[PDB]
Structure formats: structure tokens, C-alpha cells
Amino acid sequence: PTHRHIRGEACPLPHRLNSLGGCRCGKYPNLKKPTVWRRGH
Ligand SMILES: [Zn+2]
Ligand SMILES: [Zn+2]
């Protein structure tokens, strides 16, 4: 799938973010920001 950027995080890989801007696998919580769909990289 497409991984989301929380806008200014230096790419949250290799963790997979959902629509709330975080990864259920402990690393990124529910920040809820205008998250950008990035998968061109
Ligand atoms: Zn990225
Ligand atoms: Zn994670």
C-alpha cells in the first residue's frame, strides 16, 4: 500500500501508517494530521 507522510518527518518508514497518521506497530500514535500519500519512493 501507499505509506503516508505526517508532513515533515523525514519519511516514517519502514513503518506503515494508516489514515490517522500512525503505525499500529508501536512507533507512531494517532496524531491526525493532513497526511500525504507517498509511494513514489
Ligand atoms: Zn516516504
Ligand atoms: Zn511501527
UniProtKB/Swiss-Prot annotation:
> Cytoplasmic side of the membrane: what ranges?
2-41
Location(s), subcellular: Virion membrane; Host endoplasmic reticulum membrane; Host Golgi apparatus membrane; Host cell membrane
Lipid bilayer topology: Single-pass membrane protein
Binding of Zn(2+) 2: at which residues?
3, 5, 11, 41
Query: At the top level of its lineage, which domain of life is listed?
Result: Viruses
Binding locations of Zn(2+) 1: 15, 23, 25
Subunit structure of this chain's protein: Homotrimer. Interacts with the stable signal peptide. In pre-fusion state, G2 homotrimers bind G1 homotrimers via ionic interactions. Part of the GP complex (GP-C) together with glycoprotein G1 and the stable signal peptide. Acidification in the endosome triggers rearrangements, which ultimately leads to a 6 helix bundle formed by the two heptad repeat domains (HR1 and HR2) in post-fusion state. The GP-complex interacts with protein Z, which interacts with ribonucleocapsid; these interactions may induce virion budding.
Function recorded in the entry: Forms the virion spikes together with glycoprotein G1. The glycoprotein spike trimers are connected to the underlying matrix. Class I viral fusion protein that directs fusion of viral and host endosomal membranes, leading to delivery of the nucleocapsid into the cytoplasm. Membrane fusion is mediated by irreversible conformational changes induced by acidification.
**Domain notes per entry:** Contains 1 fusion peptide at the N-terminus, 2 heptad repeats domains HR1 and HR2 and, at the C-terminus, a cytoplasmic domain that plays a role in ER location. Also contains a zinc-binding domain on the cytoplasmic side that allows SSP retention in the GPC complex by accepting a cysteine from SSP as the fourth ligand.
Q: What is this protein called?
A: Glycoprotein G2
What are the leading ranks of the lineage? Viruses, Riboviria, Orthornavirae, Negarnaviricota, Polyploviricotina
Full-sequence range covered? 445 to 485 of 485
